[PDB]
Design a protein around this ligand. Structure first.
Ligand SMILES: [Mg+2]
Length: 218
């Protein structure tokens, strides 16, 4: 049987995308720029802060100095930090707390394999810390998803090989990161987005201990 589960955060445990989007929208409006709607935010999704700010600046062809750039970057981030202060256990996606309790009582290790620089904070805010055996620091990995590095660290941090582990993800690069780590991915989304060579559920309600055991058992 599998020994660990490795959790993505955004789109699996909860939604941070929403707050990033408002952060960026609130910034673009504040400095004159139109067109930073949810549609355009699909271009900012897994992208770096600097890379995102370029793309918002390219919309109006706005010129900025290097210090003006880094202050705009900071100002978005400050906003985002303010905005995730209202995160509560009310924001934990469906079926997820229950999956954690069951994994825990079955002595299955639990690890976070998230790109969020705010993982630990977010987990305390949702009252989930007590379930998690390790949090993989995204600052301590050489390269981000789709590289496997983070899933490797999450597994190792609870003392398993990723081959002993299931990864849960909502995005294409995450699936590929789980795949290249040696872990088994179970997706949440559409096969349109994630692939048809892997097991995907339509939402997080379907991620049960029994379903993960079913999938492992091949
Ligand atoms: Mg995600």
């Amino acid at each position: 049987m599998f020994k660990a589960v490795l959790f993505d955060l955004d789109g699996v445990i909860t939604d941070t995308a929403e707050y990033h989007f408002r952060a960026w929208k609130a910034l673009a409006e504040e400095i004159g720029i139109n067109g930073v709607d949810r549609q355009f935010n699909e271009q900012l999704k897994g992208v770096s802060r600097e890379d995102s700010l370029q793309k918002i600046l390219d919309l109006a062809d706005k010129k900025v100095s290097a210090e003006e750039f880094k202050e705009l970057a900071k100002r978005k981030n400050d906003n985002y930090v303010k905005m995730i202060q209202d995160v509560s256990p009310a924001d934990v996606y469906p079926g997820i707390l229950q999956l954690l309790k069951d994994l825990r009582s079955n002595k299955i290790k639990i690890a976070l394999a998230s790109a969020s620089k705010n993982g630990p904070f977010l987990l305390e805010r949702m009252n989930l810390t007590g379930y998690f055996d390790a949090i993989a620091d995204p600052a301590e990995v050489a390269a981000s998803k789709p590289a496997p590095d983070i899933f490797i660290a999450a597994a190792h941090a609870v003392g398993v090989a990723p081959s002993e582990s299931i990864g849960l993800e909502d995005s294409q690069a995450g699936i590929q990161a789980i795949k290249d780590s040696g872990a088994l991915p179970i997706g949440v989304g559409r096969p349109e987005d994630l692939g048809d060579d892997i097991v995907i559920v339509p939402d997080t309600s379907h991620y049960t201990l029994e379903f993960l055991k079913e999938v492992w058992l091949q």
